[PDB]
Design a protein around this ligand. Structure first.
Ligand SMILES: [Pr+3]
Ligand SMILES: [Pr+3]
Ligand SMILES: [Pr+3]
Length: 84
């Protein structure tokens, strides 16, 4: 299953968020790898969380690099929040 996710950085307006299509089976390590190469920020520095429109405003940390997006129940249309 492919997830279409919004990608938000802290300084961005909600109106200017990016999107990416990612497999749900992708590990958090590999999502950080992708973001690291895009942003030129080290993998070790990235902090990822997500939010669902089902529970507006609640952030869930994507903490365990070995686990997948699916493990955390990230769904189509959710928003990945990226900090460093
Ligand atoms: Pr908000
Ligand atoms: Pr927010
Ligand atoms: Pr700082």
């Amino acid at each position: 299953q492919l997830l279409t996710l919004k990608i938000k950085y802290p300084h961005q307006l909600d109106q200017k968020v990016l999107e990416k299509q990612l497999p749900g089976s992708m590990t958090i390590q590999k999502v950080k790898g992708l973001l690291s190469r895009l942003l030129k920020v080290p993998v070790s520095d990235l902090l990822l969380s997500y939010e669902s429109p089902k529970k507006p405003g609640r952030e869930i940390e994507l903490e365990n690099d070995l686990k997948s997006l699916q493990f955390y129940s990230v769904e189509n249309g959710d928003c990945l929040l990226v900090r460093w």
